[PDB]
Amino acid sequence: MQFKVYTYKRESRYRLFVDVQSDIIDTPGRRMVIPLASARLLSDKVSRELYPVVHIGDESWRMMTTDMASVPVSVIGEEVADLSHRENDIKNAINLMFWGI
Amino acid sequence: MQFKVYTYKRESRYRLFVDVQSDIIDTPGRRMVIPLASARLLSDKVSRELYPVVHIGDESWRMMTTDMASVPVSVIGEEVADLSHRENDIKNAINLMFWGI
Numbered sequence: 001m002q003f004k005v006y007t008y009k010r011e012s013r014y015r016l017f018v019d020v021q022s023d024i025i026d027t028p029g030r031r032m033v034i035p036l037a038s039a040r041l042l043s044d045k046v047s048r049e050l051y052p053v054v055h056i057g058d059e060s061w062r063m064m065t066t067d068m069a070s071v072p073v074s075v076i077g078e079e080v081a082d083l084s085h086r087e088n089d090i091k092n093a094i095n096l097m098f099w100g101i
Numbered sequence: 102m103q104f105k106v107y108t109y110k111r112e113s114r115y116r117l118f119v120d121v122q123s124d125i126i127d128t129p130g131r132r133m134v135i136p137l138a139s140a141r142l143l144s145d146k147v148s149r150e151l152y153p154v155v156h157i158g159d160e161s162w163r164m165m166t167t168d169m170a171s172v173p174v175s176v177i178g179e180e181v182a183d184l185s186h187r188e189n190d191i192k193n194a195i196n197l198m199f200w201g202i
């Protein structure tokens with residue numbers, strides 16, 4: 001579901017991802033998602049407009065916008081959070097990646 | 102480069118992809134792309150709004166919008182076409198996938 005955050009059932013580069021696909025767009029067995037990376041070890045000079053910082057499980061995470069990809073429903077694990085309150089920033093980041101200024 | 106079509110240097114599910122990332126968005130060593138599938142064998146009931154049909158090399162191809170993913174510059178092969186003339190349809194398909202109606 002759009003803006004919901006899930007874990008991967010299979011080993012991957014990242015441990016969490018946010019579903020960003022519209023709920024009215026039907027793609028049987030798959031969903032478009034954006035992985036979340038731990039913000040701790042990462043650099044602060046990285047654009048927050050393109051890579052928003054979110055807070056889940058008492059920690060900060062970076063939305064890896066440019067790592068967007070589709071995942072089969074078979075790898076979608078537990079739902080751990082809901083990022084619908086950051087819709088504005090998520091929307092801005094995605095549009096920026098494709099259409100720029 | 103945005104809207105340019107390239108071949109994959111490495112074996113993949115598809116043989117062509119269109120770069121859809123903004124030219125002003127810098128992501129060292131990577132680009133966001135959408136694969137193109139041969140339209141011949143495929144079904145005609147599939148939405149053209151979400152999966153535009155393009156013409157390259159005297160054949161028809163379907164833009165696999167929901168198969169969007171980033172690819173490292175190391176796998177980008179020969180540039181074979183330019184789809185900038187279909188910018189409107191490509192833009193509409195991408196926006197539809199994320200924001201729906």
Ligand SMILES: [Cl-]
Pocket residue numbers: 053054055056086
């Ligand atoms: Cl947050």
Ligand SMILES: [Cl-]
Pocket residue numbers: 154155156157187
């Ligand atoms: Cl065309």
